[PDB]
Design a protein around this ligand. Structure first.
Ligand code: SF4
Length: 71
């Protein structure tokens, strides 16, 4: 399975992730991105149909703010 998170410390509010994959990411309110449904650890589990999309925006994030991993 795949999970993902956003590091708000480095996010530059470029809007790519939550424009491209609104299923996974959203504007938290001030331009910075956050996953839509995070756990207490902040991680969001990704639906299998959205894995490749998530993996793509992870590579495309200009600030390397999106952390994604296989679990
Ligand atoms: S793609 Fe990266 S820099 Fe752009 S809004 Fe999402 S987390 Fe922030």
């Amino acid at each position: 399975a795949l999970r993902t998170m956003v590091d708000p410390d480095t996010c530059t509010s470029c809007e790519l992730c939550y424009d491209r994959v609104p299923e996974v990411y959203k504007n938290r309110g001030d331009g910075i991105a956050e996953v839509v449904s995070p756990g207490p650890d902040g991680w969001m589990m990704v639906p299998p149909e959205l894995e490749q999309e998530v993996k793509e925006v992870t590579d495309e994030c200009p600030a390397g703010s999106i952390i994604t991993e296989e679990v």
